[PDB]
């Protein structure tokens, strides 16, 4: 058995392993999410598609349950482990209490795992950041965000990855109860919020929307293509 | 970089960790032992640091079994650990085989235990050496001495401590093979008072013990009348 | 003890993983391997690295390793780790078949292996495997497929990939000669031969410096068949002829 | 209770220098030679004692594993003994399960798996020895070689230890595919003779053969006749 | 270089000395004990106007008569909070009565220093915690307020302040406090000092406040009552 | 400069710097004083001034009906040791239906404290103690050390600046035996007054007093229960 | 000569030459005690001789012995570190008893030697412990072959010999014995004690007294391991 | 008894360079039939079949574990298994559960992959292999098919006469058993052919 302290304190009370994990998550592809009136949407950037892949196998937007979905930035191999553990937890909760989970319940579970890997012997921390969205039985949309340290908040709209430093300033100024009225209004909002960070031009973006019905619907390339023309 | 572990030979084939655990003993106060026809006699110069302590604290003579004594030198905590191990070894032997353990067997068992701590990086060698002593109608008196490395030899008189050099030199002029315990006890008192330094250390305590035929093979502490007389004789001899 | 520890599973001051970065450069210098997907099946085509005259060709192949009745792979990097990985893949496929009484899908196989590759980078103190893999297969849901893993533990589906040595230029020339949907198995073989002919520093191929396998469906059955020296020689002759004729 | 971290790691260029150093250790052993003929294999070693005091009969370098397999080595003898013991155990387990003698290829695969385990566990070094395996099953002779890393090959004629480069450079020329076992022994002996720095004797070398009837090491009385020519 | 357990030439335990420095980088909290109850108050320290302020919970409830306010590593504090809840429920289950603030502080302080990297446990801590706590509540002797450190030393206070501005917050609390307060003047002064030391403007959504008193349970202030109090001040 | 980190490394002089540093930790604390007479033993401690608002501390704890201790050093380690001693006395009373001798208790404590000082990746308990008890043989004032050896003494003081209290103690030890309890306690409070600087005298809330004796269990005296003892110290 | 890279001289890992320096240091540890042994086997006898240098005259020299008994017909002589050698003797005794318990007959000398050698090979591989700094020599009578003489070492190498010599003066003490295996089978009769004593004395110039050596014996006439008395040793010494 | 709880009857017979195996189809519980298409013969190899009788759950479990191990073996080695090797592997599998055993008695019949020499064998519940040269039986009507085979068997038979004999034996054997019947399936393993047939039996 391997029992060593990998992440330990430092002069001035820093955790260098966690700081390095965050410096790593600061290099992924940008993700953006907003919370609508009756819809929730996410959006991820594709650095390059390479003209030879199969996009069905490199998707960064999964579905943990009927009403919960997520999108990450960082390291895909770690993201996969976290996602599968969250799926098993959702099934256990359904089995024991006879009701689908809340968004905050699964956010707490994920953050607890991430924190546990910062204080155990013989482990390094996870190198991913997640954005979790969904609806509940009340009919209230939610949007959260976790960190490699185990801390999570609730936000109106947020952006993770590289270029988030400008996506956040853009979204701060432009977010208002007017761009929220309708789905084809919020979706164009998200698209123009992502486009000024995509310096390639055009659509190198994946965009998934989730409404109270027809869950985790994913916009087709042609459909997403139409919106870009409308903006211009 | 070879001074930090008991798993590293020096380029010349030495183990400096054991060599240092030996210095730990090579600067501690002296204890002697003397073998006789009838029995054995232990003697230790017990140091009294300040007035505050009660006399009787930090004893260096233990009772490992009803016929085995023991005198120690070095780190007293390690010494007490070893004394518990030895008590454990003797009791198990009696419960397995139905009679008392021979001193030769006990010393062999404890030396193996001590040597097991000289091979690994996860532990450190003990920092105390000690002497044993018994008396049995079968083999008569006996005396052994174990080192921090785990070597155990038989002796006629041993002088573990800091004044080993001066202690051994004076004990060799004794003719112990013919004396008796009553005639040896006085000699132990005298030689300890001679080897004792009265400058660095100002005050010291003296305690004695013996195991022989006069105690019917049971280890004891020398009674108070014998001790007072011994001290007086030593003082008279010293001038 | 702490003095002798090498700390294989820690982050770098910039968020990197140095042991994985070094295993990737190890895999950089291995023998060239390449795969190509088509309408009626997939194909692998590796390069023979040990060409000594005094060797023996007892095995039906050198870098193929049929994993199941429907799949097969190929490796680049360290043979000793490759053997461990291949044994593990076979065991995973048989456990699936025992539980469900149906063959396993290719994506599930690749996933179950990449989990093991990832668990070697997060805890344990060991070093990671220095091996990259390519897979080919056929299942009920998606038909002919072609994947690829790497030491870190992330995979991805492709249509024409390449690992090993000079894989950069291999993929560069693959991008300009592959047309989605219209490629048949014969045009696939032609392109594979003509890519291998260049991305190898030698003057020209030898039909024994290469190793070629295919995969097809015939009469409701999968057939995995390693091509023969005469067939390869004929293909090389065909390549020699047409190329010569153009100029 | 033991270390849990690896002692073999990757370098900025992707090398494993502990394995490279175990190979440098192997490159300083005694010469070994194997040659596969049309109806058998031949292993021949240099068993050169330090002085006349050493009793030659007590220790052997050519050992059997089953009734049809035998091997030699180059590198470190105390490691070679561990490998020999585990190979014997592996063969016995196979026979216990299948009631059949193990084939040479399965034997080599299991041995190389053990040697590979010693490159990635915690607190150990790799073996400093390469092997040369011999066998005969289903009417065919085999000859493999195993490295300190865990990679095995298959040959027709190879050479280990000191002066292996010139050994195989000389071995390539003479080798014929129609060679009989008795005429292959001459070439094996001759190859050893190229780099011996001394005078050949019935106690300077060891020789084992394997054909249809099983494995056995030749006796000095027979090595004498073979050396007479 | 060193291990986690390693004394210094002054016998100081380097890792604990660093975990203590990890607290001068948190947001200030304040507790005050009266003859009519206790009050807790903590700054929320909002980052950007897009973050929901109802999602920063730094004052939790341990039981119907005990509450807690933390500072430091909010990710670390959650295991302590959970274990305190579980211990209180066990005590109720076994003895059919409510635990005491002293017993809860003492049981929580026994998890600190329980770290190491060899022969510790199957799954054990690898470093000390980085959270300081503040317990409040009423029991068979009245309102009480305790304080906990990462070293494991717990004291009993009547007006304590923890955080990054405490060396300035106590310099005012020692002048303001007296043994003849009421909870209302306590609340007023606890708000005045916060306003004194904070960087933003003390309005009704970037602070938090709760109170326990001998009559009622643990109760949190509302954005109605809180606003009225702030406006009244 | 490479022997001062691990507890399993000897120096070229045969010393253990880690054990040393763990002792220098114990010197940081506030002073304590113990002493015994013909029939009673007594502990007196000085609760340190932490701040202008906090209740001082707990420096004297019950171990059993006849045993009580007083600590100086790491309080977490101190109460970790106190729990072990309490379980020891409870186990004793369960098996033999009688109390425990203070000497055997201190033996168990020393044997337990010694083990950490020898293994890799472990550290010594950084706390010194002072035990007081009554038994068939009368009072006892044992003292322990981070290095597991313990002592037996008529009167001992541990803590910062306790050199002056130790000098006073030996200088006046000539009469501790005959003296009465009131006389005995005052001798303790004077000695404890010695270590305080010039600007401070004993008040009524920065001192604690423990007492065990022939016909009396171990008791601790609260803030204003120590008033009958400080009335005469002029 | 042989370069170094990393932790080569501190743990058992390969040097840039594949040399294992940490095992070349236990050989130097062998020469720390300052003794020398010599074993010679004859046509019907095996003999051990050992220096007996006690430091000064307060020890009970009846306890300072380098000769040990493993079973009734096997004897041994150690050289190197004393406590190490005691642990190795205990291990050999346990191995020899377990063999008889398991298989019903008495263990041979070469089998016991091989067991001790593979026990030491493990210390040469794992990094948490150190090799034992001692050598070993064994003798005994094999019912099939006759006399046998074997020797291990800290590296795990366990050859068999016609006449050995271990200790501080190993090289020259073997150079002497080299010249005498030329003819007469090195005096293959019960008086190889003469050869052993002569070889021990030639390069030490002591002309030992009747009590500065120990000798042990096994014979085909009486197989058990016997330790010859002082008088017997004196008679041989007197004849010299 | 437990091995009489689902019924069943298996039979193998040897000819001149040919083997034959047969079974019945009924699947039922103590005294009531459920289906009539239960499979009791499994194709372990190109010319290597195995027939299982006894408790049906254990029939299915043992068949599945055996297929597991045989797939792994043929992937690791590189060739097909021999009839003798398969028998030893099955005996080992059954003996691993010596205490708490499977309630199933297997039967093996194949052809040597290089000499085309037949092979029949049966094992007991614990793994005792007995190889014969005429025929083996297993099931609830063992005595009936013993009486039939001893009388009807001849040496060096053709595939035609072998089929006639094994069918005529199975029919009259199961016509006198209460918990066997509902039809019989016969496999004929020749050198280059494997012919399967279904006989018309009684359905009462």
From Swiss-Prot, chain C:
Gene name tied to this protein: Psma4
PROSITE patterns (alphabetical): PROTEASOME_ALPHA_1, PROTEASOME_ALPHA_2
Domain of life: Eukaryota
SMART domains reported in the protein's UniProt record: Proteasome_A_N
Pfam family, one: Proteasome
Chain positions with Phosphoserine modification: 12, 74, 172
Cellular component, GO annotation: cytoplasm; cytosol; nucleoplasm; nucleus; P-body; proteasome complex; proteasome core complex; proteasome core complex, alpha-subunit complex
UniProt subunit comment: The 26S proteasome consists of a 20S proteasome core and two 19S regulatory subunits. The 20S proteasome core is a barrel-shaped complex made of 28 subunits that are arranged in four stacked rings. The two outer rings are each formed by seven alpha subunits, and the two inner rings are formed by seven beta subunits. The proteolytic activity is exerted by three beta-subunits PSMB5, PSMB6 and PSMB7.
Modified residues (N6-acetyllysine): 126, 175
Tissues showing expression: Ubiquitous.
Family: Belongs to the peptidase T1A family.
Matching SUPFAM superfamilies: N-terminal nucleophile aminohydrolases (Ntn hydrolases)
Function of the molecule: Component of the 20S core proteasome complex involved in the proteolytic degradation of most intracellular proteins. This complex plays numerous essential roles within the cell by associating with different regulatory particles. Associated with two 19S regulatory particles, forms the 26S proteasome and thus participates in the ATP-dependent degradation of ubiquitinated proteins.
Name listed for the protein in its UniProt record: Proteasome subunit alpha type-4
Subcellular localization(s) per the UniProt record: Cytoplasm; Nucleus
Biological source species: Rattus norvegicus (Rat)
UniProtKB/Swiss-Prot annotation, chain D:
Compartments reported by the entry: Cytoplasm; Nucleus
Pfam families: Proteasome (PF00227), Proteasome_A_N (PF10584)
GO BP, one annotated term: response to virus
Signal peptide: none
Annotated tissue distribution: Ubiquitous.
Keywords carried by this UniProt record: Acetylation, Cytoplasm, Nucleus, Phosphoprotein, Proteasome
Modified sites of kind Phosphotyrosine: 3, 21, 73, 118
PTM annotation (Phosphoserine): residues: 4, 11, 13
CDD domains attached to this UniProt entry: proteasome_alpha_type_2
Sequence positions bearing N6-acetyllysine: 67, 168
Lineage: superkingdom: Eukaryota
Intrachain disulfide bonds: none
Principal location listed in the UniProt entry: cytoplasm
NCBIfam families, A to Z: PRK03996.1
Function: Component of the 20S core proteasome complex involved in the proteolytic degradation of most intracellular proteins. This complex plays numerous essential roles within the cell by associating with different regulatory particles. Associated with two 19S regulatory particles, forms the 26S proteasome and thus participates in the ATP-dependent degradation of ubiquitinated proteins.
Oligomeric form and interacting partners: The 26S proteasome consists of a 20S proteasome core and two 19S regulatory subunits. The 20S proteasome core is a barrel-shaped complex made of 28 subunits that are arranged in four stacked rings. The two outer rings are each formed by seven alpha subunits, and the two inner rings are formed by seven beta subunits. The proteolytic activity is exerted by three beta-subunits PSMB5, PSMB6 and PSMB7.
Family, as annotated: Belongs to the peptidase T1A family.
Name of the protein in its database record: Proteasome subunit alpha type-2
Organism: Rattus norvegicus
Lineage of the organism: Eukaryota, Metazoa, Chordata, Craniata, Vertebrata
UniProtKB/Swiss-Prot annotation, chain F:
Positions in coiled-coil regions: none
GO molecular function: lipopolysaccharide binding
GO BP annotation list: immune system process; negative regulation of inflammatory response to antigenic stimulus; proteasome-mediated ubiquitin-dependent protein catabolic process
Organism classification: Eukaryota, Metazoa, Chordata, Craniata, Vertebrata
Matching SMART domains: Proteasome_A_N
PROSITE patterns: PROTEASOME_ALPHA_1, PROTEASOME_ALPHA_2
Annotated glycan sites: 107
The protein, known as: Proteasome subunit alpha type-1
Tissue: Ubiquitous.
Swiss-Prot/TrEMBL keywords: Acetylation, Cytoplasm, Glycoprotein, Immunity, Isopeptide bond, Nucleus, Phosphoprotein, Proteasome, Ubl conjugation
Modified residues (Phosphoserine): 107, 174
Subcellular location field: Cytoplasm; Nucleus
Modification comment: Proteolytically cleaved from a C-terminal extension in the course of the conversion of the proteasome from its latent form into its active form.
Family named by the database record: Belongs to the peptidase T1A family.
Assembly notes: The 26S proteasome consists of a 20S proteasome core and two 19S regulatory subunits. The 20S proteasome core is a barrel-shaped complex made of 28 subunits that are arranged in four stacked rings. The two outer rings are each formed by seven alpha subunits, and the two inner rings are formed by seven beta subunits. The proteolytic activity is exerted by three beta-subunits PSMB5, PSMB6 and PSMB7. Interacts with NOTCH3. Interacts with ZFAND1.
SUPFAM superfamilies tied to this protein: N-terminal nucleophile aminohydrolases (Ntn hydrolases) (SSF56235)
Covalent cross-link site, Glycyl lysine isopeptide (Lys-Gly) (interchain with G-Cter in ubiquitin): 112, 205
UniProtKB/Swiss-Prot annotation, chain H:
InterPro entries found in the cross-reference section: Ntn_hydrolases_N, Proteasome_beta_3, Proteasome_bsu_CS, Proteasome_sua/b, Proteasome_suB-type
Xref: Pfam families: Proteasome
Gene: Psmb3
Family statement drawn from the similarity comment of this UniProt entry: Belongs to the peptidase T1B family.
Protein name: Proteasome subunit beta type-3
Single biological process term from Gene Ontology: proteasome-mediated ubiquitin-dependent protein catabolic process
Job description of the protein: Non-catalytic component of the 20S core proteasome complex involved in the proteolytic degradation of most intracellular proteins. This complex plays numerous essential roles within the cell by associating with different regulatory particles. Associated with two 19S regulatory particles, forms the 26S proteasome and thus participates in the ATP-dependent degradation of ubiquitinated proteins.
N-acetylserine: residues carrying this PTM: 1
Residue spans crossing the bilayer: none
One Gene Ontology term, aspect cellular component: cytoplasm
Assembly information from the UniProt record: The 26S proteasome consists of a 20S proteasome core and two 19S regulatory subunits. The 20S proteasome core is a barrel-shaped complex made of 28 subunits that are arranged in four stacked rings. The two outer rings are each formed by seven alpha subunits, and the two inner rings are formed by seven beta subunits. The proteolytic activity is exerted by three beta-subunits PSMB5, PSMB6 and PSMB7.
CDD domains per record: proteasome_beta_type_3 (cd03759)
Keyword list, A-Z: Acetylation, Cytoplasm, Nucleus, Proteasome
Protein localization: Cytoplasm; Nucleus
Keyword Ribonucleoprotein: no
Lineage start: Eukaryota, Metazoa, Chordata, Craniata, Vertebrata
N6-acetyllysine: residues carrying this PTM: 76
Disulfide bonds: none
């Amino acid at each position: 058995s391997y029992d060593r302290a990998i992440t330990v304190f430092s002069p001035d009370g820093h955790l260098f392993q966690v700081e390095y994990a965050q410096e790593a998550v600061k290099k992924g592809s940008t993700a953006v999410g907003v919370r609508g009136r009756d819809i929730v949407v996410l959006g991820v950037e594709k650095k390059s598609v390479a003209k030879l892949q199969d996009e069905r196998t490199v998707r960064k937007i999964c579905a943990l349950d009927d009403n919960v979905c997520m999108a990450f930035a960082g390291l895909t191999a770690d993201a996969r482990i976290v996602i599968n553990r969250a799926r098993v937890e959702c099934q256990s909760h359904r089995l024991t209490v006879g009701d689908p989970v809340t968004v905050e319940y699964i956010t707490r579970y994920i953050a607890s795992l991430k924190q546990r890997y910062t204080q155990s012997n013989g482990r390094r921390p996870f190198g991913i950041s997640a954005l979790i969205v969904g609806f509940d039985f009340d009919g209230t949309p939610r949007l959260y965000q976790t960190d490699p340290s185990g801390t999570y908040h609730a936000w109106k709209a947020n952006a993770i990855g590289r270029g988030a430093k400008s996506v956040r300033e853009f979204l701060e100024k432009n977010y208002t109860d007017d761009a929220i009225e309708t789905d084809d209004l919020t979706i164009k909002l998200v698209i123009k919020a992502l486009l000024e960070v995509v310096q390639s031009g055009g659509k190198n973006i994946e965009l998934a929307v989730m409404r109270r019905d027809q869950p985790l619907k994913i916009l087709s390339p042609e459909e997403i293509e139409k919106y870009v023309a409308e903006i211009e | 970089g070879y001074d930090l572990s008991a798993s590293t030979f020096s380029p010349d084939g030495r183990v400096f960790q054991v060599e240092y655990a030996m210095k730990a003993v090579e600067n501690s106060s002296t204890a002697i032992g003397i073998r006789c026809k009838d029995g054995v006699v232990f003697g230790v110069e017990k140091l009294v640091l300040s007035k505050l302590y009660e006399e009787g604290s930090n004893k260096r003579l233990f009772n490992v079994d009803r016929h085995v004594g023991m005198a120690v030198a070095g780190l007293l905590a390690d010494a007490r650990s070893l004394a518990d191990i030895a008590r454990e070894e003797a009791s198990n032997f009696r419960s397995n085989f139905g009679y008392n353990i021979p001193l030769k067997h006990l010393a062999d068992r404890v030396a193996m235990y001590v040597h097991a701590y000289t091979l690994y990086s996860a532990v450190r060698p003990f920092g105390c050496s000690f002497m044993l002593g018994s008396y049995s109608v079968n083999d008569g008196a006996q005396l052994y001495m174990i080192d921090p490395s785990g070597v155990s030899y038989g002796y006629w008189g041993c002088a573990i401590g800091k004044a080993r050099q001066a202690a051994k030199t004076e004990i060799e002029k004794l003719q112990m093979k013919e004396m008796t315990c009553r005639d040896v006890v006085k000699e132990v008192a005298k030689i300890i008072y001679i080897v004792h330094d009265e400058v660095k250390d100002k005050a010291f305590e003296l305690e004695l013990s013996w195991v022989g035929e006069l105690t019917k093979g049971r280890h004891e502490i020398v009674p108070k009348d014998v001790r007072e007389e011994a001290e007086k004789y030593a003082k008279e001899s010293l001038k | 003890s702490r003095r002798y520890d090498s700390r294989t599973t820690i982050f770098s001051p910039e968020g990197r993983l140095y042991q994985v970065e070094y295993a990737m450069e190890a895999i950089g210098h291995a023998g060239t391997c390449l795969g190509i997907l088509a309408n009626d099946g997939v194909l692998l085509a590796a390069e023979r690295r040990n060409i000594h005259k005094l060797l023996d060709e007892v095995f039906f192949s050198e870098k193929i390793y049929k994993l199941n009745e429907d799949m097969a792979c190929s490796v680049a990097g360290i043979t000793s780790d490759a053997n461990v990985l291949t044994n593990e893949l076979r065991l995973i496929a048989q456990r699936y078949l025992l539980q469900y009484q149906e063959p396993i899908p290719c994506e599930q196989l690749v996933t179950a292996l990449c989990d093991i590759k990832q668990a070697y980078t997060q805890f344990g103190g060991k070093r990671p495997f220095g091996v990259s893999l390519l897979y080919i297969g056929w299942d009920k849901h998606y038909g002919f497929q072609l994947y690829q893993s790497d030491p870190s533990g992330n995979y991805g589906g492709w249509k024409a990939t390449c690992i090993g040595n000079n894989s950069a230029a291999a993929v560069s020339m693959l991008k300009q000669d592959y047309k989605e949907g219209e490629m048949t198995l014969k045009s696939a073989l032609a392109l594979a031969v003509k890519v291998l002919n260049k991305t190898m520093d030698v003057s020209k191929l030898s039909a024994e410096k290469v190793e070629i396998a295919t995969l097809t469906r015939e009469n409701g059955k999968t057939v995995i068949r390693v091509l023969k020296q005469k067939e390869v020689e004929q293909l090389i002759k065909k390549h020699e002829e047409e190329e010569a004729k153009a100029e | 209770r033991g270390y849990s971290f690896s002692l073999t790691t990757f370098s900025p260029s992707g090398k494993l220098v502990q394995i490279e150093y175990a190979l440098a250790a192997v490159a300083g052993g005694a010469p070994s030679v194997g040659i596969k003929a049309a109806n058998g294999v031949v292993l021949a070693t240099e068993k050169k004692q330090k002085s006349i005091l050493y009793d030659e009969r007590s220790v052997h370098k050519v050992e059997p594993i089953t009734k049809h397999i035998g091997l030699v080595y180059s590198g470190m003898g105390p490691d070679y003994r561990v490998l020999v013991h585990r190979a014997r155990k592996l063969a016995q387990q196979y026979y216990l399960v299948y009631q059949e003698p193990i084939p040479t290829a399965q034997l080599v695969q299991r041995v190389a798996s053990v040697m590979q385990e010693y490159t990635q566990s915690g607190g150990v070094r790799p073996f400093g020895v390469s092997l040369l395996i011999c066998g005969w099953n289903e009417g065919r002779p085999y000859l493999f070689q195993s490295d300190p890393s865990g990679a095995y090959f298959a040959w027709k004629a190879t050479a280990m230890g000191k002066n292996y480069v010139n050994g195989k450079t000389f071995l390539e020329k003479r080798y014929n595919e129609d060679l009989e076992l008795e005429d292959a022994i001459h070439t094996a002996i001759l190859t050893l003779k190229e780099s011996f720095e001394g005078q050949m004797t019935e106690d300077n070398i060891e020789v084992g053969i394997c054909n249809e009837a099983g494995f056995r090491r030749l006796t000095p009385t027979e090595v004498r006749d073979y050396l007479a020519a | 270089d060193r291990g986690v357990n390693t004394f210094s030439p002054e016998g100081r335990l380097f890792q604990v000395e660093y975990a203590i420095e990890g607290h001068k980088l948190g947001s200030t909290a304040i507790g005050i004990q009266t003859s009519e109850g206790v009050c807790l108050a903590v700054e929320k320290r909002i980052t950007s106007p897009l973050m929901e302020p109802s999602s920063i919970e730094k004052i939790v409830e341990i039981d119907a008569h005990i509450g807690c306010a933390m500072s430091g590593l909010i990710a670390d504090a959650k295991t302590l909070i959970d274990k305190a809840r579980v211990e209180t429920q066990n005590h109720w289950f076994t003895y059919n009565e409510t635990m005491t603030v002293e017993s809860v502080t003492q049981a929580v302080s026994n998890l600190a220093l329980q770290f190491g990297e060899e022969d510790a446990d199957p799954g054990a801590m690898s470093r000390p915690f980085g959270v300081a706590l503040l317990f409040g509540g009423v029991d068979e002797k009245g309102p009480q307020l305790f304080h906990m450190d990462p070293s494991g030393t717990f004291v009993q206070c009547d007006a304590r302040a923890i955080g990054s501005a405490s060396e300035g917050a106590q310099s005012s609390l020692q002048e303001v406090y007296h043994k003849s307060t009421t909870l209302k003047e306590a609340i007023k002064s606890s708000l005045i000092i916060l306003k004194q030391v904070m960087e933003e403007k003390l309005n009704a959504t970037n602070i938090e406040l709760a109170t326990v008193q001998p009559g009622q349970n643990f109760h949190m202030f509302t954005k109605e009552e809180l606003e009225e109090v702030i406006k009244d001040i | 400069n490479q022997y001062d980190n691990d507890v399993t490394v000897w120096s070229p002089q045969g010393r253990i710097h880690q054990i040393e540093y763990a002792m220098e930790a114990v010197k940081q604390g506030s002073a304590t004083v113990g002493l015994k007479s013909k029939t009673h033993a007594v502990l007196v401690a000085l609760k340190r001034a932490q701040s202008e608002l906090a209740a001082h501390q707990k420096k004297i704890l019950h171990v059993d009906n006849h045993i009580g201790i007083s600590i100086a050093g790491l309080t977490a380690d101190a109460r970790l040791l106190c729990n072990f001693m309490r379980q020891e006395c409870l186990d004793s009373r369960f098996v033999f239906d009688r109390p425990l001798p203070v000497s055997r208790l201190v033996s168990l404590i020393g044997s337990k404290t010694q083990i950490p000082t020898q293994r890799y990746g472990r550290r010594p308990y950084g706390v010194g103690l002072l035990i007081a008890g009554y038994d068939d043989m009368g009072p006892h004032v044992f003292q322990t050390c981070p290095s597991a050896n313990y002592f037996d003494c008529r009167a001992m003081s541990i803590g910062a600046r306790s050199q002056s209290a130790r000098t006073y103690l030996e200088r006046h030890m000539s009469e501790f035996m005959q003296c009465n309890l009131d006389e005995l306690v005052k001798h303790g409070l004077r000695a404890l007054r010695e270590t305080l600087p010039a600007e401070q005298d004993l008040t009524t809330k920065n001192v604690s007093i423990g007492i065990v004796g022939k016909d009396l269990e171990f008791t601790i005296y609260d803030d204003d229960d120590v008033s009958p003892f400080l009335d005469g110290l002029e | 000569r042989g370069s170094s890279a990393g932790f080569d001289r501190h743990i058992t890992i390969f040097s840039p030459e594949g040399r294992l320096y940490q095992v070349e240091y236990a050989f130097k540890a062998i020469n720390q005690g300052g003794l020398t042994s010599v074993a010679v086997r004859g046509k019907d006898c095996a003999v051990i001789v050992t220096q007996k240098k006690v430091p000064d005259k307060l020890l009970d020299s009846s306890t300072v012995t380098h000769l040990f008994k493993i079973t009734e017909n096997i004897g041994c002589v150690m050289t190197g570190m004393t406590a190490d050698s005691r642990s190795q003797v205990q291990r050999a005794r346990y191995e020899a008893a377990n063999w008889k318990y398991k298989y019903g007959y008495e263990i041979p000398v070469d089998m016991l030697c091989k067991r001790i050698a593979d026990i030491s090979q493990v210390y040469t591989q794992n990094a948490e412990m150190r090799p034992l700094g001692c050598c070993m020599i064994l003798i005994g009578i094999d019912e099939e072959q006759g006399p046998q003489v074997y020797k291990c070492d800290p590296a795990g190498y366990y050859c068999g010999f016609k006449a050995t010599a271990a200790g501080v003066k190993q090289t020259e003490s073997t150079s002497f014995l080299e010249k005498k295996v030329k003819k007469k089978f090195d005096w293959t009769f019960e008086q190889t004690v003469e050869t052993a004593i002569t070889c021990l004395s030639t390069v030490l110039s002591i002309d030992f007294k009747p009590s500065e050596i120990e000798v042990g014996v096994v014979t085909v006439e009486n197989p058990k391991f016997r330790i010859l008395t002082e008088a017997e040793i004196d008679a041989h010494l007197v004849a010299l | 008894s437990v091995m009489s709880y689902n019924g069943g009857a298996v039979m193998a017979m040897k000819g001149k360079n040919c083997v034959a195996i047969a079974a019945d189809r009924r699947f039922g519980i103590q005294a009531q039939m459920v289906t009539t298409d239960f499979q009791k013969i499994f194709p372990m190899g190109d010319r290597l079949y195995i027939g299982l009788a006894g408790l049906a759950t254990d029939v299915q479990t043992v068949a599945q574990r055996l297929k597991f191990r045989l797939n792994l073996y043929e992937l690791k080695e590189g060739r097909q298994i021999k009839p003798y090797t398969l028998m030893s592997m099955v005996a080992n599998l059954l003996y691993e559960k010596r205490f708490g055993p499977y309630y199933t008695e297997p039967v093996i019949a194949g052809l040597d992959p290089k000499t085309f020499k037949p092979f029949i064998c049966s094992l007991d519940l614990i793994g005792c292999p007995m190889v014969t040269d005429d025929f083996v039986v297993s099931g609830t009507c063992s005595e009936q098919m013993y009486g039939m085979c001893e009388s009807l068997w001849e040496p060096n038979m053709d595939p035609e006469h072998l089929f006639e004999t094994i069918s005529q034996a199975m029919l009259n054997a199961v016509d006198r058993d209460a918990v066997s019947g509902m039809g019989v399936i016969v496999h004929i393993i020749e050198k280059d052919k494997i012919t399967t047939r279904t006989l018309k039996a009684r359905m009462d």
